[PDB]
From a paper:
Previous studies have confirmed that the B318L protein encoded by the ASFV represents a new member of the viral PT family, according to sequence alignment and a follow-up enzymatic assay. These experiments have shown that the B318L protein catalyzes the condensation of isopentenyl diphosphate (IPP) with allylic diphosphates to produce C20-geranylgeranyl diphosphate (GGPP) and longer chain prenyl diphosphates. Taken together, these experiments indicate that B318L is an essential gene for viral replication.
For crystallization, the N-terminal putative transmembrane region (residues 1–30) was truncated. Thus, the truncated form of B318L (residues 31–318) was expressed in E. coli. In this study, taking advantage of an accurate model predicted from AF2, the crystal structure of the B318L protein was successfully solved by MR at 3.2 Å. The overall structure of B318L adopts a canonical all-helix fold and contains 11 helices (A to K) which can be divided into three layers. The front helical layer is formed by helices A, B, and E. The front layer is orthogonal to the other layers. In the middle layer, there are helices C, D, F, I, and K. The conserved Asp-rich motifs FARM (residues 129–135) and SARM (residues 257–261) are located at helices D and I, respectively. The remaining helices G, H, and J, surrounding the catalytic core, form the back layer. However, there are three loop regions (S133 to K143, Q209 to P214, and H262 to N269) that could not be built due to the lack of interpretable electron density. The most significant difference is the various conformations of their N-terminal extensions, where the N-terminus of B318L starts with a long loop, whereas helices are observed in the N-terminus of other GGPPS. Since the experimental structure inherently belongs to the apo form of the B318L protein, its protein-ligand contact area is much closer to the apo templates.
Residue numbers in the entry: 31 to 132, 144 to 206, 215 to 261, 270 to 318
Amino acid sequence: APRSVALFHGIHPLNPKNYKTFSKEFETILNNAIEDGDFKGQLTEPCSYALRGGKYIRPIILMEIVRACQLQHSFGAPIYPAEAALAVEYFHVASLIIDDMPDTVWARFGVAKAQMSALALTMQGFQNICRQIDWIKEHCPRFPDPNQLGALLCTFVSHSLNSAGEKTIPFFKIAFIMGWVLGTGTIEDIGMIERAAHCFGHAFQLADDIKDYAKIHGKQKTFDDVAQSLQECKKILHGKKIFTSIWNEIFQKVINVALGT
Protein backbone atom coordinates (compact mmCIF):
# COMPACT_ATOMS: atom_id res chain seq x y z
CA ALA A 1 0.00 0.00 0.00
CA PRO A 2 1.62 3.26 -1.17
CA ARG A 3 1.77 5.70 1.72
CA SER A 4 1.35 9.45 2.21
CA VAL A 5 2.98 11.94 4.60
CA ALA A 6 -0.01 13.45 6.44
CA LEU A 7 -3.81 13.70 6.23
CA PHE A 8 -5.53 15.18 9.30
CA HIS A 9 -4.29 16.82 12.48
CA GLY A 10 -5.90 17.78 15.77
CA ILE A 11 -8.85 15.47 15.08
CA HIS A 12 -11.02 14.19 17.92
CA PRO A 13 -12.43 10.97 16.44
CA LEU A 14 -15.60 10.28 18.43
CA ASN A 15 -16.60 13.86 19.35
CA PRO A 16 -20.15 14.81 18.42
CA LYS A 17 -19.60 17.28 15.55
CA ASN A 18 -22.13 19.22 13.44
CA TYR A 19 -22.39 19.13 9.65
CA LYS A 20 -20.33 22.29 9.07
CA THR A 21 -17.42 21.09 11.22
CA PHE A 22 -17.66 17.69 9.57
CA SER A 23 -17.63 19.51 6.22
CA LYS A 24 -14.63 21.69 7.08
CA GLU A 25 -12.86 18.56 8.32
CA PHE A 26 -13.52 16.64 5.12
CA GLU A 27 -12.40 19.63 3.08
CA THR A 28 -9.07 19.74 4.90
CA ILE A 29 -8.88 15.94 4.47
CA LEU A 30 -9.58 16.19 0.73
CA ASN A 31 -7.14 19.06 0.18
CA ASN A 32 -4.36 17.37 2.16
CA ALA A 33 -5.12 14.12 0.33
CA ILE A 34 -4.53 15.73 -3.06
CA GLU A 35 -1.07 16.93 -2.06
CA ASP A 36 0.42 13.85 -0.37
CA GLY A 37 0.23 11.95 -3.66
CA ASP A 38 -3.03 10.63 -5.05
CA PHE A 39 -3.54 12.15 -8.50
CA LYS A 40 -0.11 12.19 -10.06
CA GLY A 41 0.30 12.47 -13.81
CA GLN A 42 -1.24 14.80 -16.34
CA LEU A 43 -4.68 14.36 -14.75
CA THR A 44 -3.55 16.21 -11.60
CA GLU A 45 -5.38 19.34 -12.78
CA PRO A 46 -8.65 17.67 -14.02
CA CYS A 47 -9.60 15.88 -10.81
CA SER A 48 -8.63 18.80 -8.54
CA TYR A 49 -10.89 20.98 -10.70
CA ALA A 50 -13.78 18.54 -10.39
CA LEU A 51 -13.65 17.77 -6.66
CA ARG A 52 -12.80 21.22 -5.20
CA GLY A 53 -16.05 22.63 -3.70
CA GLY A 54 -19.22 20.59 -3.15
CA LYS A 55 -21.99 19.38 -0.80
CA TYR A 56 -19.64 16.60 0.37
CA ILE A 57 -22.74 14.99 1.88
CA ARG A 58 -21.96 11.36 0.96
CA PRO A 59 -18.54 11.33 2.72
CA ILE A 60 -20.14 13.13 5.68
CA ILE A 61 -22.74 10.37 5.92
CA LEU A 62 -19.93 7.80 5.88
CA MET A 63 -17.96 9.54 8.63
CA GLU A 64 -20.90 10.12 10.97
CA ILE A 65 -22.07 6.52 10.63
CA VAL A 66 -18.57 5.36 11.57
CA ARG A 67 -18.11 7.73 14.52
CA ALA A 68 -21.55 6.90 15.91
CA CYS A 69 -20.98 3.14 15.62
CA GLN A 70 -17.54 3.51 17.21
CA LEU A 71 -19.19 5.18 20.21
CA GLN A 72 -21.14 1.94 20.81
CA HIS A 73 -18.09 -0.36 20.64
CA SER A 74 -14.43 0.07 19.77
CA PHE A 75 -11.61 -2.19 18.60
CA GLY A 76 -8.63 -0.37 20.10
CA ALA A 77 -8.05 3.25 18.95
CA PRO A 78 -11.21 4.85 17.45
CA ILE A 79 -11.61 4.57 13.64
CA TYR A 80 -11.70 7.95 11.90
CA PRO A 81 -12.65 7.01 8.30
CA ALA A 82 -10.71 9.44 6.11
CA GLU A 83 -9.41 7.42 3.16
CA ALA A 84 -12.80 5.72 2.89
CA ALA A 85 -14.75 9.00 2.88
CA LEU A 86 -12.28 10.15 0.25
CA ALA A 87 -13.24 7.09 -1.78
CA VAL A 88 -16.95 7.87 -1.38
CA GLU A 89 -16.62 11.38 -2.78
CA TYR A 90 -14.27 10.03 -5.47
CA PHE A 91 -16.86 7.58 -6.82
CA HIS A 92 -19.63 10.17 -6.63
CA VAL A 93 -17.59 12.87 -8.41
CA ALA A 94 -16.56 10.49 -11.20
CA SER A 95 -20.26 9.86 -11.80
CA LEU A 96 -20.73 13.62 -12.23
CA ILE A 97 -17.83 13.96 -14.68
CA ILE A 98 -19.38 11.23 -16.80
CA ASP A 99 -22.85 12.81 -16.60
CA ASP A 100 -21.71 16.18 -17.96
CA MET A 101 -20.09 14.61 -21.02
CA PRO A 102 -21.61 14.87 -24.56
CA ASP A 103 -18.30 25.53 -17.40
CA THR A 104 -17.87 21.76 -17.27
CA VAL A 105 -14.96 19.44 -16.50
CA TRP A 106 -14.46 18.38 -20.12
CA ALA A 107 -14.60 22.02 -21.23
CA ARG A 108 -11.42 23.34 -19.63
CA PHE A 109 -9.42 20.17 -20.36
CA GLY A 110 -11.14 18.11 -23.05
CA VAL A 111 -13.50 15.14 -23.05
CA ALA A 112 -10.53 12.78 -23.44
CA LYS A 113 -8.95 14.00 -20.21
CA ALA A 114 -12.44 14.12 -18.70
CA GLN A 115 -13.00 10.37 -18.91
CA MET A 116 -9.34 9.64 -18.15
CA SER A 117 -9.85 11.62 -14.94
CA ALA A 118 -13.11 9.85 -14.05
CA LEU A 119 -11.33 6.50 -14.32
CA ALA A 120 -8.46 7.84 -12.20
CA LEU A 121 -10.82 8.89 -9.40
CA THR A 122 -12.66 5.56 -9.36
CA MET A 123 -9.35 3.66 -9.39
CA GLN A 124 -7.74 5.57 -6.56
CA GLY A 125 -11.02 5.48 -4.66
CA PHE A 126 -10.67 1.71 -4.50
CA GLN A 127 -7.00 2.27 -3.71
CA ASN A 128 -7.94 4.39 -0.68
CA ILE A 129 -10.44 1.66 0.24
CA CYS A 130 -7.54 -0.77 0.55
CA ARG A 131 -5.57 1.99 2.31
CA GLN A 132 -8.29 2.36 4.96
CA ILE A 133 -8.12 -1.40 5.51
CA ASP A 134 -4.34 -1.17 5.95
CA TRP A 135 -4.68 1.71 8.43
CA ILE A 136 -7.18 -0.42 10.37
CA LYS A 137 -4.75 -3.35 10.35
CA GLU A 138 -2.01 -1.19 11.85
CA HIS A 139 -4.01 0.65 14.54
CA CYS A 140 -6.86 -1.82 15.26
CA PRO A 141 -5.59 -5.31 16.14
CA ARG A 142 -8.91 -6.38 17.72
CA PHE A 143 -10.85 -5.50 14.56
CA PRO A 144 -12.62 -8.67 13.34
CA ASP A 145 -11.09 -10.28 10.18
CA PRO A 146 -10.15 -7.13 8.19
CA ASN A 147 -9.19 -8.93 4.96
CA GLN A 148 -12.53 -10.70 4.41
CA LEU A 149 -14.59 -7.64 5.35
CA GLY A 150 -12.46 -5.41 3.11
CA ALA A 151 -12.97 -7.77 0.18
CA LEU A 152 -16.72 -7.77 0.89
CA LEU A 153 -16.75 -3.96 0.95
CA CYS A 154 -14.98 -3.82 -2.40
CA THR A 155 -17.52 -6.36 -3.71
CA PHE A 156 -20.54 -4.34 -2.63
CA VAL A 157 -19.12 -1.08 -3.98
CA SER A 158 -18.41 -3.06 -7.16
CA HIS A 159 -21.96 -4.37 -7.59
CA SER A 160 -23.31 -0.90 -6.82
CA LEU A 161 -21.04 0.90 -9.31
CA ASN A 162 -22.21 -1.10 -12.33
CA SER A 163 -25.88 -0.83 -11.25
CA ALA A 164 -26.03 2.89 -12.16
CA GLY A 165 -28.44 3.24 -15.08
CA GLU A 166 -32.00 5.86 -9.96
CA LYS A 167 -28.33 6.72 -10.43
CA THR A 168 -28.22 8.93 -7.31
CA ILE A 169 -29.15 6.06 -4.98
CA PRO A 170 -26.16 3.69 -5.38
CA PHE A 171 -23.57 6.20 -4.20
CA PHE A 172 -25.55 6.80 -1.01
CA LYS A 173 -25.69 3.02 -0.66
CA ILE A 174 -21.88 3.08 -0.87
CA ALA A 175 -21.68 5.77 1.81
CA PHE A 176 -24.06 4.01 4.20
CA ILE A 177 -22.86 0.41 3.82
CA MET A 178 -19.17 1.31 3.90
CA GLY A 179 -19.62 3.49 6.97
CA TRP A 180 -21.71 0.73 8.56
CA VAL A 181 -19.13 -2.03 8.30
CA LEU A 182 -16.22 0.30 9.05
CA GLY A 183 -17.87 1.72 12.15
CA THR A 184 -18.15 -1.93 13.19
CA GLY A 185 -17.15 -5.32 11.73
CA THR A 186 -20.85 -6.25 11.81
CA ILE A 187 -22.52 -7.34 8.57
CA GLU A 188 -25.24 -8.21 11.08
CA ASP A 189 -27.94 -5.97 9.55
CA ILE A 190 -26.51 -4.75 6.25
CA GLY A 191 -29.78 -5.16 4.35
CA MET A 192 -31.52 -2.90 6.85
CA ILE A 193 -28.80 -0.30 6.21
CA GLU A 194 -29.42 -0.84 2.49
CA ARG A 195 -33.06 0.13 2.91
CA ALA A 196 -31.98 3.08 5.07
CA ALA A 197 -29.57 4.38 2.41
CA HIS A 198 -32.16 3.69 -0.28
CA CYS A 199 -34.89 5.69 1.46
CA PHE A 200 -32.48 8.55 2.10
CA GLY A 201 -31.12 8.68 -1.44
CA HIS A 202 -34.68 8.56 -2.73
CA ALA A 203 -35.70 11.53 -0.58
CA PHE A 204 -32.56 13.40 -1.67
CA GLN A 205 -33.17 12.85 -5.38
CA LEU A 206 -36.83 13.84 -5.06
CA ALA A 207 -35.98 16.99 -3.10
CA ASP A 208 -33.48 17.81 -5.86
CA ASP A 209 -36.10 17.37 -8.60
CA ILE A 210 -38.46 19.66 -6.65
CA LYS A 211 -35.80 22.44 -6.40
CA ASP A 212 -37.24 25.44 -8.34
CA TYR A 213 -49.65 30.11 -9.79
CA ALA A 214 -49.41 27.02 -12.02
CA LYS A 215 -51.90 24.48 -10.65
CA ILE A 216 -49.01 21.97 -10.75
CA HIS A 217 -49.60 21.08 -7.08
CA GLY A 218 -46.55 22.10 -5.20
CA LYS A 219 -46.02 18.45 -5.87
CA GLN A 220 -47.07 17.98 -2.28
CA LYS A 221 -47.33 14.33 -3.38
CA THR A 222 -43.57 14.26 -3.98
CA PHE A 223 -42.95 15.94 -0.61
CA ASP A 224 -45.10 13.26 1.02
CA ASP A 225 -42.84 10.67 -0.62
CA VAL A 226 -39.74 12.56 0.60
CA ALA A 227 -40.88 12.84 4.21
CA GLN A 228 -42.19 9.26 4.28
CA SER A 229 -38.85 7.88 3.09
CA LEU A 230 -37.05 10.18 5.55
CA GLN A 231 -39.27 8.82 8.33
CA GLU A 232 -38.49 5.21 7.46
CA CYS A 233 -34.76 5.98 7.24
CA LYS A 234 -34.84 7.63 10.67
CA LYS A 235 -36.70 4.57 11.94
CA ILE A 236 -33.86 2.27 10.87
CA LEU A 237 -31.28 4.74 12.23
CA HIS A 238 -32.78 4.95 15.72
CA GLY A 239 -33.30 1.20 15.38
CA LYS A 240 -29.52 0.77 15.45
CA LYS A 241 -28.74 3.57 18.00
CA ILE A 242 -26.81 5.66 15.43
CA PHE A 243 -29.54 8.30 14.96
CA THR A 244 -27.45 11.24 16.20
CA SER A 245 -28.06 15.00 16.22
CA ILE A 246 -26.34 15.42 12.85
CA TRP A 247 -29.25 13.60 11.24
CA ASN A 248 -31.53 16.39 12.48
CA GLU A 249 -29.49 19.01 10.59
CA ILE A 250 -29.25 16.72 7.55
CA PHE A 251 -32.97 15.86 7.38
CA GLN A 252 -33.93 19.51 7.71
CA LYS A 253 -31.46 20.50 4.98
CA VAL A 254 -33.14 17.94 2.70
CA ILE A 255 -36.58 19.26 3.68
CA ASN A 256 -35.61 22.91 3.17
CA VAL A 257 -34.47 21.93 -0.32
CA ALA A 258 -38.01 20.74 -1.13
CA LEU A 259 -39.55 23.82 0.55
CA GLY A 260 -37.66 26.46 -1.45
CA THR A 261 -36.18 27.75 1.83
